[PDB]
Each structure stands twice: as structure tokens, then as C-alpha cells.
Ligand binder design. Structure first.
Ligand SMILES: C/C=C/C(=O)SCCNC(=O)CCNC(=O)[C@H](O)C(C)(C)COP(=O)(O)OP(=O)(O)OC[C@H]1O[C@@H](n2cnc3c(N)ncnc32)[C@H](O)[C@@H]1OP(=O)(O)O
Ligand SMILES: CCCCCCCCCCCC(=O)SCCNC(=O)CCNC(=O)[C@H](O)C(C)(C)COP(=O)(O)O
Ligand SMILES: [Fe+3]
Ligand SMILES: [Zn+2]
Lengths: 210, 265, 233, 123, 87, 29, 249
């Protein structure tokens, strides 16, 4: 039987809280990092300096730690999660290292991305998977659990397959992309003052209601 | 209190008036270009066509989730952040102990191109992974849908069947019991081991525990949020050496301790 | 330009000063409600002068994100969870076009990989749930399947259909009357006249469903739920 | 998927100061110190870089001779660090700096002894 | 120089003598690879005795789950030659 | 209508006295 | 060096500045105001030479930040005591100027060290990629390190200048040689820190928590003083000359 409760909230005037603590697990956002207003960070989430998390992204660190490294970006509507354990036996924290570009609509769970990598849009990285440094994943790629992307290579497909070896100039292009995305995120960061003015709207909506 | 309190209250009123006037002047200098933030108009639960969602008492619905129309959700289920369950042109049914993970879309169809158009049915103890798309299909009890999978109209996922992550399951495809399908288009991959059935069941049971802590946190009032912010700040670090010099033992308050069923151990 | 950006910056200094003054005034009166964590999400957000222009008839879900120079035509609809980002270039959506729930219509964030292509959506276009359109053009009366990805430089001609889950690679021109699917997307079959009728009927229906949804969201915010949330213990 | 994390996985065993043996896991191409810190056998906070210039023998391990043959010989800097970090200022012939040992497929099954941790958190 | 392990050959020797001196073990079947139960004629009570005779000779206590993976002379020598607590 | 925290009111008065005294100190020196 | 390293970092900061001012005041009032042979001046001369040599070499050997700062302070007290040895009014003036400038520079360095201790900075190698993760902080620490090395036009150049001035006046040439060699060694082990923050590309980085407002304000003021003191140095020169004469008359 589906028995409803009368006191369940149908409309919350505060909206969705961006930072969701879980006990003593408080998400940690660097003072110079951009996090879009409708992003949810929950639990053991650390967003480091120069990193950006874009609209609709969800970073849920309730089973393991989630880290977004220096100058790394998680783009629109990505979901980053983690598990208690990995099939490989290695620690199952989700580690996004520095200068990593995680393309929009990508799903990450208990994967490690080494520094200076690019993840194509709409990619999936599963539990225990590893992307070694200076690698690029094509859009739409699916990396099964425990699988690995060797360093200095271009991979893609469902499941991901070796395509070719990257030229050194291509590998030099990756941190440049991360820096450019950080520069773009700075324009969004400057649109927000440290406090919103919503509390005044709440005030007057209360006052009209006695 | 008293005359001094009233005087300071009046001075503060003047200060707030000046502050708001300065804010307006700055807004005018900006050229009226900045769009103002407003009170949130998102409705977690919303009627449409005189149909009201029927949500059980102990169901975690994230505030950012959109549950619309003729939608029924059973005991112990959880609707995570950014999930959209739009039951406007037809019925959406969700069973007991079923998790619909982050950023999932569940929709229906009024009429399909051919065959009999059916609602979206999701059974009990079913896991639906992050950012899945469930459209006009049927998922029977104790089934698994990987993250980023897309099920089209007419798809039937049988009991103890698995759809792998990223799979595109074509219309009217049937996933038989004890089988795992995957790819674009999805096709038979292999059989499911008993350990994998245990994995599916443990997944749903773990998510009922995770739903409780998330539902507890998301429903806290402003006053409780501020009390726990202060507590979290006060207990973030420690000086047990000076405590031992003082002869006291500082204990973590219960509002900051998670239940044992969600801890890794 | 530069003068507008300087004025916009100096205005933020005056505004931040005024808001701090208001906070001081509340602290003198013992009010701390300014500390409440309220959502700063804006359905229509501007990046300096680049602001979305949305028709008065086009329905936009309150949880949708429309950022920068984004044009929405009459009778169009942006559904729940959709994200449209028009900063580095413009995004235009034609009349009578439905962007289904959780879709992402965006342009390139950087010009490192070439000039940033804009995204053009024609009239009476259906974009299925959770589709990703990145710097492509979609002509009038086309069908984009749910979960499909169209990369930059992609042209989808009139009456052309991208199947569900298809990854259309960069600079891939979909000819008229053709169904393309798979990863990567390849020609699958030719489109039938019944399919063209269903496309048009579907877009007309979504314009009518959007009208219904735009009405129920317009309902005044319930003061009962406000009072229930305020008085929780 | 052709390339797997299990290709790089090197099996190991570590004997803790109290004498109980543990089977630990590390990636070939990474240091023994990182494998030891995965499960907390060595505190990761005590040794955050894999550099000889950021080492006070917090990563020190003892390895039996049958596995020392399979490793590159200790350099002068390593022996300098080990000798100065000894309490008795005596070099231990079976002692290695874990941050300088790189795991290889040839080190499968190696047993390592983890000594008692030295103080490292300078006030 | 200071060592933290007993030499393998020296252990092989100490273990070879311990196993042989234990009665019911003729110094003819005692090879470095010889197994206690299958090749030496020692039952479970005699087999546990050998393992703790290795504890007395080398002056350290073997955790039981290791005392069980010592069914032969290789497994015992493999264990003592790599255990730091051995003296 | 009234601010009730009496310690906060005293501190506000102390800050006001500090500011006014600094101004007078400068003006008469 | 052992006490500086082992004490809590605020204790080390306080010990590296305050007690030097108090005891140099005591030294100047007990001996300069007093009267004996050049024996005591030879004592301080030989101790100054030994201090410069040992401080330079031991600092060159250090891999940890606190120990390096300790040995640097030993070398600089040697530089300062050279001014006491020569036994002139300008010697006392330059000793006071050196003490002042060393105190300000040491407070700058320890504000940086205390800011980085929130992330538990222990080794010089821990400063890798600091020019990327906090560019303004890396520049501020480099200005301090170049001031320590004595490179002009930074405030630290006054100590070097007087060291060589007194030597070529008091007639010393061995002292000039020791000063040259020790200055070059010091420049090497100071610019090693700049090389670590700017030139190295480590595999693993350490991201440091930003400092609080107190340390940032103090750092900004001390950095402005270090870069700009020689543009308007007259008040320090005049006040130190005033003090030097108050001792006798
Ligand atoms: C506690 C909370 C629990 C939860 O709620 S889970 C949260 C979200 N997590 C998930 O959804 C994870 C779902 N897991 C999976 O989907 C996974 O893949 C899966 C579980 C099907 C399969 O994972 P496996 O590692 O077991 O894959 P196989 O052993 O069957 O490999 C077969 C073959 O298929 C190919 N590969 C396998 N997987 C896939 C796919 N899908 N597609 C395409 N191609 C593939 C690949 O070529 C493989 O060959 P190799 O690489 O040489 O081993
Ligand atoms: C310092 C002295 C203090 C302590 C005093 C000691 C007191 C000891 C007296 C009490 C202990 C007992 O007799 S307890 C009685 C022990 N007897 C049994 O267990 C009966 C079943 N028999 C068997 O299990 C096997 O025949 C067996 C050979 C044992 C092994 O098995 P294996 O065939 O597979 O080697
Ligand atoms: Fe080391
Ligand atoms: Zn639909």
C-alpha cells in the first residue's frame, strides 16, 4: 500500500541546497573555484583551486571520496559518484587530477583520471577504471569496470577501443584546454556577489503573510 | 532591550534603507543588464491534468527532483537529485525499495506508433543507474539498469535481468531473466552469476540506507541547519592534549554521527 | 563593450557595498535570515550583455538553465532539466520546437579546437530526452532521438531523423529523409511518409502539452507549503 | 577491453611491526610506498611525494635478500638518508627507501617488512 | 652493518635440523621440498608440534593462519627467511 | 521593534564611542 | 637549528627576532659603553667569520625549510657582528640597520612559512609548482629570498654593502674574501627555492590552503618595505645614527 504523508513538502521556497553535508562530511570548495548554482555537492567532495563544475552536475560523495583537482573541470549534467570498493581491489575513491577536462554529460564512478587528460562528451567511466596521463577519450566512449586507457593514446567507442597514438603537440594541447575552460569559468564567477538578495524576497513574502 | 535597544533598532533601519538604495544605484550603473535572482519556483511534486502524484511516507524525493502528474511511488523508494518523473500523458508506477539515481528521466507515451501503448512500470527493489532514460517500458522486480542506459517504448526487463551501462535497448526488446545485455544496439552479452544477483539485491538495500541520510539532511529547517553548521565548525579539529590537561573528554554530538549502515566498514 | 564592462564592474562594487550595509543593519537588529542558504539558480542568466531572449508564448521550465545569447521562438518549449549555454557563440531555437527533459544544447567553451560554431535549431523540431547538441545545425521539421549526440559542424537537413543513442561525428551531414543511427551514426534506412506525419503531429502535441505545463507552473506559490516549511520542528 | 588495470597489478605481502602478514596490491610503474599507503600501512600524510629530497626514511622498508637481488642497487643518497635516519646511525643492509623502489612484474610475490613509524610531524 | 633477516641457507639448515631431530622423522626423507603430512608420516598433532618447534628455535610466534600454510619445508623456510621477528 | 541582546547593544555603544572619540581626538589635536 | 626546527612554528618565529634585539642592546651597553682591549673585538670578529662560513655551508646542506632559515639566521648574525667588531659609530649604525632589516625580512619569511604550515609544509621540495597554484605568493617568497641573498635594489643589500665597506676600511681582505664566497654560496641556496617554485615540474603537487587576513596584510606591508626601502631610507638611517650616539653622549 502506498500511504502518503500530508506534511511532505511539495514546494520548497529555498530550492535545492547546493552543499549537502552528511554528518561530518562537508563538501569543500576552493575560494577561487566556480560551482554553478544548481550543482549538488554531497558528502566527501573536494573541489580544488581553479576548478569548475557546471550546470546540472551532481557530485555525490556518500560512499567514497570525490576530488576535482587543480584547474580541472566537470561540465554540464555530469554525474560523479563512487563506491565502497573496486573490483580491482584498489581504493575506490573518484580522483580527477589536475588539468583534466571531463566533457559534458559524462558519468564517472570510482574511476581515476591521471593529470592532463580529456574525456569526451557523453562518456562513461565505470568502477575501478583508470585513464593514464596524456590520454584522450572520444565522445560517447564507454569504459567497462577495471579497464585501462594507456598513456599517450586516443581511445573511443562502446566499449572503448584503441584508435591511434597521440602526437606530442596534441598532448601539449590538453592543459591549454583546461586553462581556457578555467578562463571561461572566471566570467561566470564574476557574476555572483558573496551573498544573494533572495532573503529580502523571503522577508517580504513573509510580511505579506503576517 | 529598552530605550537603547529601540534606538539601535531605528539606526539599523536607517542603515538598511541606505544599503538598499546603494544597491539600487549600483544596479542602475550596471545598466539594468544583470538578471536578478528570485525566489525558487521549482515544484518537487506538481499536479497536471488534475492528476496528483501519490508518494509514500518514507520515500526520499530530492528537492531538485521533478515528480509530475499521475505518478505512484512505493515504500522505501528514493528519487535522487535532478530526476524527472513526468507522468503527464500516462501513468508512471514505481514499486517498493526502488532507487532512481541522479539525473534520470522517466517519461511515458500517450500513443506509440504501433502495438498497444503502455505506461512506465518499475517494480520492487529495482536499481536505475545515474542519468538513465526510461521511456514507456516495463522493469520487473529485482532488475538492474546501468547508468546512462536508454530503454525505449515496449522494452521489458525481466526479473533478475541486467541492462549494462550505456546500452541503447531498442523498442519492444525483451531482456530475459538471468541475462545481461549491452551495446548500441543492446544485445546478449552473457549470463548473470549468483554473485551478481546478490550484488543487485545488496545495491537496492544499500540505497534504502543512503536515502535515509539524504532525506534527513534535505528536510532540515534553517535553525537546525545553522545549529549543525556551528557544531561542525566546533568539532572539525581537536586538541585532545589540552583536554587531558583540563580533565575533560569532548564527544561528537549525535547529530553529526552517521548510522552504521552507511559506513564503509 | 569595454565601457559597458567597466560600468558593470563598478556597479558590482556599489552593489556589494550596499548589500554589506544592509547586512550590518540586520545584525544591529538581531536578524540572521541573510545567512539562509537559498538557491541562486536563475532560469534566465546573463553573461554581462549576453542575455536570453525568449518569446512570451515559449514555455521554459523553472529548473531549466538558459545562459547567454539564447533565442527561443514562439510556441517552443524548454522542458525540465534542460541546459542551454550561449556564451562563446549564439544558440537559436525556432518556432514550435520542443527541447525535451534533461537535454543539453551548448556551444564550444573554447576556440582551441577551431572557431566556435553556433547551434541553430529550426522550426517544428523535436529534440528527444537527454540529447546533446554541440555546435550543430538542425533544420526545420527534423527528429533527434533521445540520448543522441550531435558534435560540431553537424548538419541535419529538413525531414531528417537521428535515431536514439546515435553519436553523429563532427561535420556529418544527415541528408533529407534518412534515418541515421549507431556509434558512429551511419545510414540505416529511408524515412516513410507516416514517420513524417508522426513528426509533425508530435511537435504540435508537445506545443499543446507545454501550454498545459506552463499554466500549472504559473499558479501562485502555495502559502500553506511556505508556512509548513517555516514552522518545522 | 584489451588493456586492464589488472595487467599492472603486482601482488605483494607486507609484514607489519606487530608481525602479522598482509597481502597488499600495487601498480607496476608506481613506487612501493604508494602500494603501502593504499591500505594505510604507511601513513600517506607522512610521505606525500615520491622524491628523495622529501624523504626522512618515513618510507623505509626491510626486504629479505632473495628480493634485494631483483632490485636496482641502493644509490649513495638513499644510503645517506637511511644511515642518518637510523636511531643508532647504522646502515641496515636489508633496508630500502620505499619511495625509490618502483614496482615491476618481476616483483610478484615479494615480501616486505614494515618497521615501526618514526615521528615525522615537525611542530 | 646491521641485518634484519636470517640468511636463507642458514634458515634452510636450522629448519632441516629441527624437522629431522623431531622423532618419527628419519633423516632420509627430509628434503627442502618435503611435505609434513604426505611425505614424512606426521599426523595433525605431530604436524602442529613441528611448527611450534620452529617457534622455539627461532624465538618468535607464528600467527596460526601462517602455521597452517607451513605444511612442508619450503613453506616453512619461505616464511622464516622473510619474517623480521626471526632471530 | 527592539534589539534584545544587551551585550551586543553595549558593544555597539562601545564601538560608537570609539569612533566618536577618535574623531574628537583628531579634531582637538 | 635543533630548537628552531623542533619548537612550534610561532615559537620559532618569535625566537628568530625578539631575543636578538634585546641581547644586542645588552651587548652594546655592556662593552661599547665599557672599556677593554681589542680582545673582545677579536672575539666577535672570529665568531663572525666562523658564523658566516658555517651558516653558509650548513644552509647549503639543508633540505627542510625551517633548518635552512635557522642556518641563514646564523650567517646573518655573523654579518651583523662584523659591525660590532670594527668599533666605530658607523659600525653600530650598520649593526642596528642590519638588525632592523633582518627582523622585517624574517617576519616576512615566517608569515609565508606559517601560511604554508596549514598544509604541513616540511621540505623545500614541497614548494614545487607554487608559481602555478598561487602565483602572487610564489613572487612574494621570491622577493624575500632575493632580499635574503642581498641582491639590489632589495632591502637585504644593505648588510652586504656594509660588510664589504667595513672590511675595505678597517683594512681587512681575508674578511672580504670570506664575505664574497659566503655571499655566493648563500645566493645559490636561496635561489634554489625560487628554482623549486618556478622551474620544476613535479609529478605530484601540493595545493596549499590560502592564508588568513592577518598574515596577508603583514606580508603585503613587509613585501612593499623590502622592494622599496632603498627609495626612501632616510628615517631608518637617521634614527639608527641617533641611537648609536645616545650610547656614548
Ligand atoms: C551500491 C550501489 C550500487 C548501484 O546502484 S550501481 C551505480 C551505477 N553503476 C553501474 O551502472 C555499473 C554497471 N556495470 C556495467 O554496465 C558493466 O559493463 C557490466 C557489469 C554489465 C559488465 O562488466 P564486466 O567487467 O563484467 O564485463 P565482461 O566481463 O562481461 O567483458 C565482456 C566484454 O564485453 C565488453 N564490455 C563489457 N562491458 C560492456 C558494455 N556495457 N558495453 C559494452 N561493452 C562492454 C568488453 O569487450 C568485454 O571484454 P573484455 O574487455 O576483454 O573483458
Ligand atoms: C604444563 C602442563 C599444563 C597443561 C596440562 C595438560 C593437560 C592435558 C590433558 C587434557 C587434554 C586432552 O587430553 S584433550 C583429548 C584429546 N583427544 C582427542 O582429541 C580425541 C580425538 N582424537 C583425535 O582427534 C586424534 O586422535 C589426535 C591424535 C588427538 C589428533 O588428530 P590426528 O589423528 O588428525 O592428528
Ligand atoms: Fe622516501
Ligand atoms: Zn517522452
Amino acid at each position: 500500500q502506498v500511504t502518503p504523508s500530508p506534511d511532505r513538502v511539495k514546494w520548497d521556497y529555498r530550492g535545492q541546497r547546493q552543499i549537502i553535508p552528511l554528518g561530518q562530511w562537508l563538501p569543500k570548495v576552493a575560494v577561487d573555484a566556480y560551482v554553478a548554482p544548481n550543482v549538488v555537492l554531497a558528502g566527501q567532495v573536494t573541489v580544488w583551486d581553479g576548478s569548475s563544475v557546471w550546470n546540472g552536475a551532481v557530485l555525490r560523495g556518500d560512499l567514497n571520496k570525490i576530488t576535482v583537482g587543480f584547474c580541472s573541470n566537470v561540465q554540464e549534467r555530469c554525474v560523479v559518484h563512487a563506491a565502497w570498493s573496486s573490483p580491482t581491489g584498489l581504493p575506490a575513491q573518484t580522483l580527477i587530477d589536475r588539468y583534466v577536462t571531463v566533457g559534458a554529460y559524462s558519468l564517472l564512478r570510482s574511476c581515476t583520471i591521471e593529470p592532463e587528460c580529456i574525456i569526451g562528451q557523453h562518456s562513461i567511466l565505470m568502477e575501478g577504471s583508470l585513464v593514464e596521463t596524456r590520454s584522450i577519450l572520444e565522445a560517447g566512449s564507454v569504459l567497462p569496470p577495471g579497464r585501462r586507457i594507456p598513456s599517450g593514446e586516443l581511445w573511443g567507442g562502446n566499449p572503448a577501443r584503441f584508435i591511434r597514438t597521440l602526437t606530442n603537440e596534441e598532448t601539449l594541447e590538453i592543459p591549454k584546454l583546461a586553462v581556457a575552460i578555467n578562463h571561461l569559468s572566471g566570467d561566470y564567477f564574476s557574476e555572483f556577489l558573496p551573498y544573494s538578495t533572495i532573503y529580502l524576497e523571503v522577508e517580504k513574502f513573509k510580511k505579506s503573510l503576517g | 532591550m529598552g530605550t537603547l535597544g529601540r534606538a539601535i533598532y531605528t539606526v539599523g533601519n536607517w542603515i538598511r534603507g541606505t544599503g538598499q538604495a546603494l544597491d539600487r544605484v549600483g544596479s542602475l550603473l550596471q545598466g539594468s543588464h544583470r538578471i536578478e535572482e528570485h525566489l525558487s519556483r521549482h515544484r518537487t511534486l506538481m499536479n497536471v491534468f488534475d492528476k496528483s502524484p501519490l508518494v509514500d511516507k518514507d520515500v526520499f524525493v530530492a528537492p531538485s527532483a521533478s515528480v509530475i502528474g499521475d505518478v505512484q511511488i512505493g515504500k522505501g523508494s528514493s528519487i535522487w537529485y535532478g530526476c524527472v518523473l513526468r507522468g503527464d500523458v500516462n501513468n508512471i508506477s514505481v514499486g517498493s525499495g526502488t532507487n532512481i539515481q541522479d539525473n534520470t528521466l522517466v517519461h511515458v507515451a500517450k500513443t506509440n506508433i504501433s502495438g498497444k501503448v503502455l505506461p512506465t512500470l518499475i517494480g520492487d527493489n529495482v536499481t536505475v543507474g545515474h542519468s538513465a532514460v526510461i521511456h514507456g517500458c516495463t522493469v520487473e522486480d529485482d532488475a538492474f539498469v546501468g547508468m546512462g542506459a536508454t530503454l525505449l517504448d515496449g522494452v521489458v526487463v525481466e526479473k533478475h535481468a541486467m541492462v549494462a551501462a550505456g546500452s541503447l535497448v531498442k523498442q519492444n526488446t525483451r531482456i530475459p531473466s538471468g541475462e545481461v545485455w549491452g551495446g548500441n544496439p543492446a544485445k546478449f552479452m552473457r549470463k548473470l552469476t549468483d554473485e551478481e544477483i546478490v550484488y543487485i539485491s545488496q545495491s537496492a538495500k544499500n540505497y534504502i540506507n543512503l536515502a535515509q541520510i539524504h532525506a534527513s539532511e534535505n528536510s532540515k529547517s534553517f535553525e537546525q541547519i545553522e545549529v549543525e553548521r556551528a557544531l561542525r565548525k566546533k568539532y572539525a579539529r581537536k586538541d585532545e592534549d589540552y583536554d587531558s590537561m583540563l580533565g575533560i573528554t569532548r564527544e561528537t554530538p549525535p547529530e553529526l554521527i552517521l548510522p552504521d549502515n552507511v559506513l564503509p566498514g | 563593450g569595454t565601457l559597458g564592462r567597466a560600468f558593470y564592474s563598478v556597479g558590482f562594487w556599489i552593489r556589494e557595498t550596499g548589500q554589506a550595509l544592509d547586512r550590518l543593519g540586520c545584525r544591529l537588529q538581531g536578524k540572521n535570515y541573510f545567512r539562509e542558504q537559498l538557491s541562486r539558480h536563475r532560469t534566465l542568466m546573463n553573461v554581462f550583455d549576453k542575455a536570453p531572449i525568449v518569446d512570451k508564448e515559449a514555455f521554459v521550465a523553472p529548473s531549466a538553465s538558459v545562459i547567454g545569447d539564447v533565442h527561443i521562438g514562439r510556441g517552443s518549449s524548454i522542458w525540465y532539466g534542460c541546459v542551454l549555454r550561449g556564451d562563446v557563440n549564439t544558440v537559436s531555437v525556432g518556432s514550435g520546437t520542443n527541447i525535451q527533459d534533461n537535454s543539453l544544447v551548448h556551444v564550444a567553451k573554447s576556440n582551441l579546437s577551431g572557431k566556435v560554431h553556433p547551434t541553430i535549431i529550426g522550426d517544428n523540431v523535436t529534440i528527444g530526452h537527454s540529447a546533446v547538441l554541440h555546435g550543430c545545425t538542425v533544420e526545420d521539421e527534423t527528429f533527434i532521438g533521445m540520448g543522441a549526440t550531435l558534435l560540431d559542424g553537424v548538419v541535419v537537413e529538413k525531414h531528417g531523423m537521428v535515431a536514439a543513442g546515435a553519436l553523429v561525428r563532427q561535420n556529418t551531414r544527415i541528408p533529407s529523409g534518412e534515418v541515421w543511427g549507431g556509434n558512429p551514426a551511419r545510414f540505416l534506412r529511408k524515412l516513410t511518409d507516416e514517420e513524417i506525419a508522426f513528426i509533425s503531429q508530435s511537435a504540435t502535441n508537445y506545443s499543446n502539452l507545454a501550454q498545459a505545463h506552463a499554466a500549472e507552473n504559473a499558479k501562485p506559490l502555495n502559502v500553506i507549503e511556505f508556512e509548513k516549511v517555516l514552522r518545522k520542528k | 577491453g584489451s588493456k586492464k588495470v589488472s595487467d599492472r597489478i603486482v601482488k605483494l605481502s607486507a609484514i607489519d611491526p606487530d608481525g602479522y602478514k598482509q597481502d597488499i596490491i600495487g601498480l607496476s610503474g608506481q613506487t612501493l610506498l604508494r602500494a603501502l599507503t593504499h591500505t594505510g600501512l604507511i601513513d600517506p600524510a607522512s610521505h606525500r611525494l615520491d622524491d628523495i629530497e622529501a624523504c626522512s626514511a618515513e618510507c623505509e622498508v626491510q626486504i629479505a635478500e632473495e628480493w634485494l637481488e631483483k632490485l636496482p642497487p641502493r644509490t649513495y643518497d638513499e644510503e645517506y638518508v637511511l644511515k642518518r635516519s637510523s636511531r643508532s646511525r647504522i646502515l641496515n643492509k636489508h633496508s630500502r627507501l620505499g619511495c625509490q623502489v618502483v614496482l615491476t612484474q618481476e616483483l610478484q610475490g615479494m615480501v616486505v617488512a614494515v618497521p615501526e613509524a618514526k615521528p615525522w610531524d615537525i611542530p | 652493518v646491521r641485518g634484519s633477516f636470517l640468511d636463507k641457507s642458514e634458515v634452510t639448515d636450522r629448519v632441516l635440523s629441527v624437522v629431522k631431530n623431531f622423532q618419527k622423522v628419519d633423516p632420509s626423507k627430509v628434503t627442502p621440498k618435503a611435505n609434513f603430512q604426505n611425505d614424512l608420516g606426521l599426523d595433525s598433532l605431530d604436524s602442529v608440534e613441528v611448527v611450534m618447534a620452529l617457534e622455539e628455535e627461532f624465538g618468535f610466534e607464528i600467527p596460526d593462519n601462517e602455521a597452517d600454510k607451513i605444511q612442508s619445508i619450503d613453506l616453512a623456510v619461505d616464511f622464516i627467511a622473510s619474517h623480521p621477528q626471526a632471530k | 521593534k527592539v534589539s534584545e541582546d544587551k551585550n551586543r547593544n553595549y558593544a555597539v555603544v562601545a564601538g560608537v564611542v570609539a569612533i566618536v572619540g577618535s574623531i574628537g581626538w583628531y579634531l582637538k589635536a | 637549528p635543533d630548537i628552531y626546527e623542533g619548537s612550534p612554528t610561532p615559537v620559532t618565529a618569535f625566537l628568530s627576532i625578539a631575543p636578538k634585539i634585546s641581547i644586542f642592546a645588552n651587548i652594546l651597553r655592556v662593552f661599547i659603553y665599557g672599556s677593554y682591549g681589542a680582545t673582545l673585538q677579536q672575539i666577535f670578529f672570529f665568531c663572525s667569520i666562523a658564523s658566516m662560513i658555517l651558516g653558509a655551508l650548513a644552509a647549503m646542506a639543508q633540505t627542510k625549510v625551517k633548518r635552512l632559515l635557522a642556518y641563514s639566521s646564523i650567517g646573518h648574525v655573523g654579518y651583523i657582528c662584523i659591525g660590532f667588531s670594527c668599533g666605530t659609530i658607523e659600525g653600530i649604525q650598520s649593526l642596528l640597520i642590519g638588525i632592523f632589516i633582518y627582523a622585517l625580512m624574517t617576519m616576512d619569511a615566517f608569515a609565508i612559512v606559517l601560511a604554508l604550515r596549514q598544509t604541513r609544509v616540511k621540505y623545500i621540495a614541497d614548494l614545487g609548482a607554487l608559481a602555478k597554484t598561487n602565483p602572487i605568493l610564489a613572487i612574494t617568497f621570491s622577493i624575500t629570498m632575493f632580499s635574503y641573498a642581498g641582491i639590489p635594489p632589495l632591502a637585504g643589500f644593505c648588510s652586504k654593502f656594509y660588510l664589504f665597506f667595513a672590511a675595505l676600511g678597517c683594512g681587512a681582505y681575508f674578511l672580504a674574501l670570506v664575505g664574497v664566497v659566503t655571499s655566493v654560496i648563500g645566493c645559490f641556496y636561496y635561489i634554489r627555492l625560487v628554482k623549486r617554485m618556478f622551474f620544476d615540474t613535479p609529478r605530484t603537487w601540493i595545493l596549499y590552503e590560502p592564508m588568513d587576513r592577518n598574515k596577508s596584510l603583514l606580508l603585503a606591508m613587509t613585501s612593499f618595505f623590502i622592494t622599496l626601502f632603498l627609495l626612501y631610507p632616510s628615517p631608518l638611517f637617521s634614527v639608527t645614527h641617533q641611537m648609536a650616539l645616545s650610547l656614548y653622549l
